[PDB]
Amino acid sequence: SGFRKMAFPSGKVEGCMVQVTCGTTTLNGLWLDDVVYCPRHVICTSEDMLNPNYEDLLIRKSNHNFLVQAGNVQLRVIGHSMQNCVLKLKVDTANPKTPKYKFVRIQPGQTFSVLACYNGSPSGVYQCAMRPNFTIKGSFLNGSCGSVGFNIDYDCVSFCYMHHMELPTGVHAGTDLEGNFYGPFVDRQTAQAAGTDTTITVNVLAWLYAAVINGDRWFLNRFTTTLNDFNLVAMKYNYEPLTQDHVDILGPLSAQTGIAVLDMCASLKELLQNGMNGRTILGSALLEDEFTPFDVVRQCSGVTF
Amino acid sequence: SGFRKMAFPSGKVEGCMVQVTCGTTTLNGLWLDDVVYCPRHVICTSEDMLNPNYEDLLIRKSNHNFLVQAGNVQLRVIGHSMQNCVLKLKVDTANPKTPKYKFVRIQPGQTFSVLACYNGSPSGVYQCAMRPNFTIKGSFLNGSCGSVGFNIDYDCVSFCYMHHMELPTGVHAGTDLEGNFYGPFVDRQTAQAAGTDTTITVNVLAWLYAAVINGDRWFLNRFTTTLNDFNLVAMKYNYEPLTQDHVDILGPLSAQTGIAVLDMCASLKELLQNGMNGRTILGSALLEDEFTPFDVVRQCSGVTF
Numbered sequence A, B: 001s002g003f004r005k006m007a008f009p010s011g012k013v014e015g016c017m018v019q020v021t022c023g024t025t026t027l028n029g030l031w032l033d034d035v036v037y038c039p040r041h042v043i044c045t046s047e048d049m050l051n052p053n054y055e056d057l058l059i060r061k062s063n064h065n066f067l068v069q070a071g072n073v074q075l076r077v078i079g080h081s082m083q084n085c086v087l088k089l090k091v092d093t094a095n096p097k098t099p100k101y102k103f104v105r106i107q108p109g110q111t112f113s114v115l116a117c118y119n120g121s122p123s124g125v126y127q128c129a130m131r132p133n134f135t136i137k138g139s140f141l142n143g144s145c146g147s148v149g150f151n152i153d154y155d156c157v158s159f160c161y162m163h164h165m166e167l168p169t170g171v172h173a174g175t176d177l178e179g180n181f182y183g184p185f186v187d188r189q190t191a192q193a194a195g196t197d198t199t200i201t202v203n204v205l206a207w208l209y210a211a212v213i214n215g216d217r218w219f220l221n222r223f224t225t226t227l228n229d230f231n232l233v234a235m236k237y238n239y240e241p242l243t244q245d246h247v248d249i250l251g252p253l254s255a256q257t258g259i260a261v262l263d264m265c266a267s268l269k270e271l272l273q274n275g276m277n278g279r280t281i282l283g284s285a286l287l288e289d290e291f292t293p294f295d296v297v298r299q300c301s302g303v304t305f
Ligand SMILES: *[C@](O)(C(=O)NC1CC1)[C@H](CCC)NC(=O)[C@@H]1[C@H]2CCC[C@H]2CN1C(=O)[C@@H](NC(=O)[C@@H](NC(=O)c1cnccn1)C1CCCCC1)C(C)(C)C
Pocket: A025, A026, A027, A039, A041, A049, A140, A141, A142, A143, A144, A145, A146, A164, A165, A166, A167, A168, A173, A185, A186, A187, A188, A189, A190, A191, A192
């Protein structure tokens, strides 16, 4: 037993990280087959970033303006193209450590593992959720751009995030591996608001199930609720509305514990309206919202990769 | 910026995990060079575990009683020996994926990454602290025994933990890689108390420094304190005493922020005596104690491996 914020094993992704330099800018790239993917702003100067014309800027570059290094091996770039906000560098060598992979776009509230890297070398791994406002609360320093987020399914690495930038609130924004930003953001150095952040209700319920599975039960009550009345209360506390599809994805945890989804929502309703009165759930004084229902099922049933 | 509970990249360790079967018991082993290490209780029946004579039990076993599998590859065991609480199986093949490694014994309050595995296959990675009472608050299910904890230094994997058992409070106990238990425990199915758990004071201070580095400063005050008077207050709240050597290891964070260690202790003293009054630090309502000073420096300066 026990319940931890657990990341996927990172080995498959480590073998894909490389260093990309253009001009005086060095960041990370992802080397899959014979293509290296990295943020397109590797091509800009400080000055360019206030209002860049990435089309015109990339036209001025040649293949030899890009130095890709995999370890001590300098890779030769044989072609460059732009796909939305990511640059794709064709190299003369396919990565032998390429895994079964796919590019996926995650939805708000889904979780992924981040392999934080600097100079093409991994520094650490952690689990994040895509917030409802399409930011992530990561840990990234200067040089971390091009670090990626991923999930594993059986043997297939699903890449879902590439890191691009930090907001003045300290949160992080980036793209999928097709180069489209999560959220309203554009890669230009201007003020760009993230929306209101809300709490990921379906994940809080998943975590309350995890708590029950681990023997923390004090918050279960005799009350129940309809889904509409639950949402009436939850929206007052800036929680995302719970949908019938969320109720269905919590089905496995409901069946395993014997606690109906709407009975768990009645427990969450009382926690919101009265607090925890100095008590904790799974050691935490705040309600946790960065575990999805599938995360709880994987961790409490022992799925391997 | 940002601050996350970050594990080391796990790739070097993944290539070392194998499955070990003896009788009807299957668990994980660690394959380094031509030796596989695993918990010695792989040799016991249910019935044996109330009072096992591991010497006599191992004498009854032969090399062929042990099935070691690395992927689909069945490894041939050519010799077996016991070192304290771990079994060492000699195999006819050195692991090609063996890294520069060493076995280390960590001290209470130090942190490490756990690669949780089942059937010799990794399921996930997370960061843990060795509690002052020599337990860890892990996430381990049936089949996770033989999973290992490790740190990385440059290119060297320092193995420090092998998982053996779970206590009725839900916490976990195991050995170093020389087979000696952390804490007072013995591998027998009897009631064995863990001592009082205390809060790792030097780590809380490290995390308050991390908060300052990330712009959370509301808890800084004009007060200061001697180290003895701080300890007088901290021991009332079941915090470990802070030593002059702890003060020295916080030196780097003090210098980087310009806040003397005893000034930060004065802030911690006020937090303990008055609470947070509904405020948070780095998003948490409770004081975090599972980041060491070196963990904070590595994460906020970007050390790679
Ligand atoms: C990344 O490219 C990298 O690791 N580079 C290696 C070291 C050489 C780098 C790392 C920072 C975490 N990312 C960036 O430099 C991005 C790029 C892409 C978008 C613009 C530039 C700057 N940048 C940033 O992350 C910055 N953040 C901002 O500029 C915010 N700007 C504002 O909030 C703002 C407010 N008022 C006026 C003007 N700007 C972002 C810009 C994009 C929309 C969200 C808000 C810094 C300051 C470097 C974190």
